[PDB]
Amino acid sequence: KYSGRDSLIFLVDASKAMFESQSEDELTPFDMSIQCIQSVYISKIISSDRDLLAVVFYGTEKDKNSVNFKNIYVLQELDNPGAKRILELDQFKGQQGQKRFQDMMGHGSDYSLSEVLWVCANLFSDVQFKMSHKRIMLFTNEDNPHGNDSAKASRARTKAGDLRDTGIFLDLMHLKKPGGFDISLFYRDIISSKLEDLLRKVRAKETRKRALSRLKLKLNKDIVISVGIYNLVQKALKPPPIKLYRETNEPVKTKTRTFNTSTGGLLLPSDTKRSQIYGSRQIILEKEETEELKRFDDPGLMLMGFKPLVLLKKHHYLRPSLFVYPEESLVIGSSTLFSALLIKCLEKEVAALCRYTPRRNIPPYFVALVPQEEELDDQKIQVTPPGFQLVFLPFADDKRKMPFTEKIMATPEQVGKMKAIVEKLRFTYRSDSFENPVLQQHFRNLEALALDLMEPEQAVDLTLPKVEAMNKRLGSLVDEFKELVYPPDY
Amino acid sequence: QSSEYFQALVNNMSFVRYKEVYAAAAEVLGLILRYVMERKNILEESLCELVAKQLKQHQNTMEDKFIVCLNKVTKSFPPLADRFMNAVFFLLPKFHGVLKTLCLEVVLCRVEGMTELYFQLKSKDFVQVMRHRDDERQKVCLDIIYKMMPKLKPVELRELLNPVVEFVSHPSTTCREQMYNILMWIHDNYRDPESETDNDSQEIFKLAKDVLIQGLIDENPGLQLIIRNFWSHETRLPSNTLDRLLALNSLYSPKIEVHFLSLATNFLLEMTSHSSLITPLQAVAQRDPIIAKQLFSSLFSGILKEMDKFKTLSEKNNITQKLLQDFNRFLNTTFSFFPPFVSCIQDISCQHAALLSLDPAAVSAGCLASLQQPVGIRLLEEALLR
DNA sequence: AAGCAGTAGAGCATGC
DNA sequence: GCATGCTCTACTGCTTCGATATCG
């Protein structure tokens, strides 16, 4: 569903040797798990800031749970990612945190069985909302935790089956007790290592989905079809700057009025008119008059001819490009007319030409509808959906005029050198990962106030050239391309 | 053939838009499943599997229609929520309105044979939905507790019993009828008869001896004939002639003093074996207090006048010292003093040289507040003589 | 747009 | 005889929020 929310429970196994250093002076798995949990929260507190995130440690000495079991301590409850939750939770970092967790809850006990999954089910059942994703993140390192009692193994796989029935799925993010993945054990009964997704890869994203307009395309006068006009490249930017009072630390709730008519007083919408000046004479009008002088047509798309895909030069563009899809609020069959029109427009490489009026009162605008056939693969590489695509087209004072009367020819002693240069610099493009410096450092700079660790954090920007690694990679042909034919010579 | 007709039917269950087709589809599915269950010769192994696969398809896309159809299939088919029993408990703190009644209607059916129940029901805060002003929820949630008594330890029964006996001040005679139906077993099989066992196994018997005595002044006769024929049963109030009179002191409970004399002569007058005038006396006593006071005050001394033949010289002293103890208990215990009862005990004691030395600290504060001073003055003067 | 919530008002059954 | 009582669904609007034009 559209207003659906997802859910995640962090189940931490801090019992026997996970609280030990594994007799290894290299890395500690408790601090690794708390670092990974802090990374998850600190990303999703600006990425997807409405899901449900809980933290639960098991195998502890005390207990805290609403069925009142033993060894099981819930810490927080299913709610938003919160600055209080992370400032509370980061008191268990390092050996100072190991000792503070020792004195605060302790470590080590004969841990549970099915009962911890019972606590997870009673944690999910309380929430009155629409849960869409039910995942459990398990941070454990042992892989036969009840390898001396088979009744607890059978009851644990039974209770995990009854958690799989109602729709709960767990993905145990494996800690590294042998470092490499050598525990090829038999844990297939419960499940449906790599940590880099939880570590780094998502410091500035968002999640959303709307439709932006639902318009109808009319062909002659009577053949109408219904299309949803989705937007797929949207230019995200930084959130609005809320206003705040100094002392009481609250919003300001501004208000706005208009007066001083050479008398003072107070005004209304009706007493005042709109106006313009053109050199010497002044015009006056009403607000409905200046809103009605730009009034042409009705909202929708109007078919005004056909053209194949050869005249439009990609020198010509004006705005981003939307994406039209056959929705389902005219008739069961507008999909079929769009499918036939799709097949014919693709195979005869023809593209539609239309007029397009976006909403209730906007001047009309010429668009061109170019088809697109989907691409998927064996492993579902769903890179394109099938449907049509708008391209905008300019009108008159869009295209300006350059000085433009310059034409000088060069000499063909440089083309092979430049071919070698561009074959030296050749990299296969991209799929993702060219993130935003300004928004990125704003995210980090806002982390450094409510988390207030030290300073502005890491601020690498993956859009700078590296001239130091460019010079040696190119080589010493810069001078010969600089002065093979042409000296500047001052 | 029998492979597509049923598929068309269970497939028409999925037509989930209009109310009449799918609810009646589920009901008639329950009828078909029940007929092929008790009529085992035709197979059911296709059909039960088919309809359960439809329901498992149902429960995650939309849930209201899932609980509705499971409710109506279980309306005549018990064993087809075992596959969904953790799903309905998963849904139970999510449903309000009529649907919480619907889930509880489901969960009543598959109890008698289920182990480890009170943990889940305690987790889903049952003792906060046993105390909300709807009526049908409160009837069904007590009919499960009449089923899950003989599976509990007394550690939890004393947590259940603390808001279930808040129902004596409730309207709606079926609800209170249930509440006086569960206490009738908790009294008859927890009688702890000097067995040296427990404090909770003796404490629930105290709080269940409270309500089967405060339930003799209920505002629905026809119900209270049940409680009277419970309390007038052989070896439950000892029915020889005199032991019933002595035992009637035991079920006093000062929430019922306004009716105590009429009830005492009623239990005493039922065990007759004269027909023309005893029955209007039973009829006339429980309407007006003063002639009833006269009737009990004469019945008491009638039996004590017969007792001097039987019940030899030591036993006379034993019964009379116990009776003196009981009357002292009465005057110390009463909270709002009833005048034609306070006068009745101080009028039946004064005429015996075995019950005189009662309690002059209790007679005084009793008859200054009952405003029956000249029976007390006569009692103390009859004491100070002889 | 995406979803919820109310309710106005025309359509089922019995009254000086 | 119309004077009353009672019941279910399509028309209106609410609220959040994402986008867009527009002002400075």
PDB file of N, CA, C and O in Angstrom, chain A residues 55-75:
ATOM      1  N   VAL A  55      15.427  -2.318  19.109  1.00  0.00           N
ATOM      2  CA  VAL A  55      16.703  -2.899  19.527  1.00  0.00           C
ATOM      3  C   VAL A  55      16.476  -3.803  20.743  1.00  0.00           C
ATOM      4  O   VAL A  55      15.871  -3.382  21.736  1.00  0.00           O
ATOM      5  N   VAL A  56      16.891  -5.068  20.636  1.00  0.00           N
ATOM      6  CA  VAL A  56      16.629  -6.085  21.651  1.00  0.00           C
ATOM      7  C   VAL A  56      17.886  -6.938  21.816  1.00  0.00           C
ATOM      8  O   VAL A  56      18.349  -7.556  20.850  1.00  0.00           O
ATOM      9  N   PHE A  57      18.437  -6.976  23.032  1.00  0.00           N
ATOM     10  CA  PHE A  57      19.572  -7.824  23.378  1.00  0.00           C
ATOM     11  C   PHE A  57      19.071  -9.059  24.108  1.00  0.00           C
ATOM     12  O   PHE A  57      18.240  -8.949  25.012  1.00  0.00           O
ATOM     13  N   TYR A  58      19.589 -10.232  23.753  1.00  0.00           N
ATOM     14  CA  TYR A  58      19.168 -11.433  24.458  1.00  0.00           C
ATOM     15  C   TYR A  58      20.376 -12.139  25.045  1.00  0.00           C
ATOM     16  O   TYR A  58      21.525 -11.822  24.732  1.00  0.00           O
ATOM     17  N   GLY A  59      20.093 -13.120  25.904  1.00  0.00           N
ATOM     18  CA  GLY A  59      21.119 -13.801  26.661  1.00  0.00           C
ATOM     19  C   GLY A  59      21.661 -13.010  27.825  1.00  0.00           C
ATOM     20  O   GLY A  59      22.656 -13.424  28.423  1.00  0.00           O
ATOM     21  N   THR A  60      21.036 -11.890  28.168  1.00  0.00           N
ATOM     22  CA  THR A  60      21.512 -11.033  29.236  1.00  0.00           C
ATOM     23  C   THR A  60      21.211 -11.668  30.591  1.00  0.00           C
ATOM     24  O   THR A  60      20.536 -12.693  30.693  1.00  0.00           O
ATOM     25  N   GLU A  61      21.717 -11.049  31.653  1.00  0.00           N
ATOM     26  CA  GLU A  61      21.518 -11.600  32.983  1.00  0.00           C
ATOM     27  C   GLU A  61      20.158 -11.235  33.561  1.00  0.00           C
ATOM     28  O   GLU A  61      19.487 -12.091  34.145  1.00  0.00           O
ATOM     29  N   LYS A  62      19.721  -9.992  33.388  1.00  0.00           N
ATOM     30  CA  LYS A  62      18.430  -9.547  33.896  1.00  0.00           C
ATOM     31  C   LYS A  62      17.332  -9.920  32.900  1.00  0.00           C
ATOM     32  O   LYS A  62      17.524 -10.762  32.021  1.00  0.00           O
ATOM     33  N   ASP A  63      16.149  -9.319  33.040  1.00  0.00           N
ATOM     34  CA  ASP A  63      15.093  -9.519  32.060  1.00  0.00           C
ATOM     35  C   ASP A  63      14.169  -8.311  32.033  1.00  0.00           C
ATOM     36  O   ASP A  63      13.955  -7.657  33.053  1.00  0.00           O
ATOM     37  N   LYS A  64      13.621  -8.023  30.850  1.00  0.00           N
ATOM     38  CA  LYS A  64      12.668  -6.921  30.687  1.00  0.00           C
ATOM     39  C   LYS A  64      11.795  -7.239  29.476  1.00  0.00           C
ATOM     40  O   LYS A  64      12.223  -7.024  28.342  1.00  0.00           O
ATOM     41  N   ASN A  65      10.584  -7.732  29.728  1.00  0.00           N
ATOM     42  CA  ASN A  65       9.642  -8.116  28.685  1.00  0.00           C
ATOM     43  C   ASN A  65       8.258  -8.296  29.287  1.00  0.00           C
ATOM     44  O   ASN A  65       8.118  -8.646  30.459  1.00  0.00           O
ATOM     45  N   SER A  66       7.241  -8.052  28.465  1.00  0.00           N
ATOM     46  CA  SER A  66       5.877  -7.905  28.954  1.00  0.00           C
ATOM     47  C   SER A  66       5.174  -9.231  29.200  1.00  0.00           C
ATOM     48  O   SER A  66       4.109  -9.245  29.823  1.00  0.00           O
ATOM     49  N   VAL A  67       5.730 -10.341  28.730  1.00  0.00           N
ATOM     50  CA  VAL A  67       5.264 -11.638  29.197  1.00  0.00           C
ATOM     51  C   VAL A  67       6.054 -12.073  30.426  1.00  0.00           C
ATOM     52  O   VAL A  67       5.659 -13.039  31.101  1.00  0.00           O
ATOM     53  N   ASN A  68       7.124 -11.343  30.768  1.00  0.00           N
ATOM     54  CA  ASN A  68       8.000 -11.584  31.919  1.00  0.00           C
ATOM     55  C   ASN A  68       8.635 -12.975  31.850  1.00  0.00           C
ATOM     56  O   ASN A  68       8.266 -13.914  32.554  1.00  0.00           O
ATOM     57  N   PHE A  69       9.572 -13.080  30.919  1.00  0.00           N
ATOM     58  CA  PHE A  69      10.450 -14.230  30.830  1.00  0.00           C
ATOM     59  C   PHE A  69      11.757 -13.924  31.559  1.00  0.00           C
ATOM     60  O   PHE A  69      11.857 -12.956  32.315  1.00  0.00           O
ATOM     61  N   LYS A  70      12.770 -14.758  31.352  1.00  0.00           N
ATOM     62  CA  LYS A  70      14.082 -14.569  31.944  1.00  0.00           C
ATOM     63  C   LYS A  70      15.118 -14.494  30.836  1.00  0.00           C
ATOM     64  O   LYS A  70      14.897 -14.987  29.732  1.00  0.00           O
ATOM     65  N   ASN A  71      16.244 -13.848  31.147  1.00  0.00           N
ATOM     66  CA  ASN A  71      17.411 -13.619  30.288  1.00  0.00           C
ATOM     67  C   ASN A  71      17.143 -12.717  29.082  1.00  0.00           C
ATOM     68  O   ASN A  71      18.044 -12.536  28.255  1.00  0.00           O
ATOM     69  N   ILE A  72      15.951 -12.141  28.934  1.00  0.00           N
ATOM     70  CA  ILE A  72      15.583 -11.415  27.718  1.00  0.00           C
ATOM     71  C   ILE A  72      15.250  -9.978  28.077  1.00  0.00           C
ATOM     72  O   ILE A  72      14.338  -9.726  28.871  1.00  0.00           O
ATOM     73  N   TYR A  73      15.955  -9.038  27.461  1.00  0.00           N
ATOM     74  CA  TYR A  73      15.851  -7.624  27.792  1.00  0.00           C
ATOM     75  C   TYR A  73      15.541  -6.865  26.516  1.00  0.00           C
ATOM     76  O   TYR A  73      16.431  -6.675  25.685  1.00  0.00           O
ATOM     77  N   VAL A  74      14.295  -6.427  26.357  1.00  0.00           N
ATOM     78  CA  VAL A  74      14.003  -5.442  25.323  1.00  0.00           C
ATOM     79  C   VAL A  74      14.518  -4.092  25.806  1.00  0.00           C
ATOM     80  O   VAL A  74      14.539  -3.806  27.007  1.00  0.00           O
ATOM     81  N   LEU A  75      15.002  -3.265  24.889  1.00  0.00           N
ATOM     82  CA  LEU A  75      15.537  -1.980  25.300  1.00  0.00           C
ATOM     83  C   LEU A  75      14.638  -0.827  24.895  1.00  0.00           C
ATOM     84  O   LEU A  75      14.290   0.008  25.732  1.00  0.00           O
TER      85      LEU A  75
END
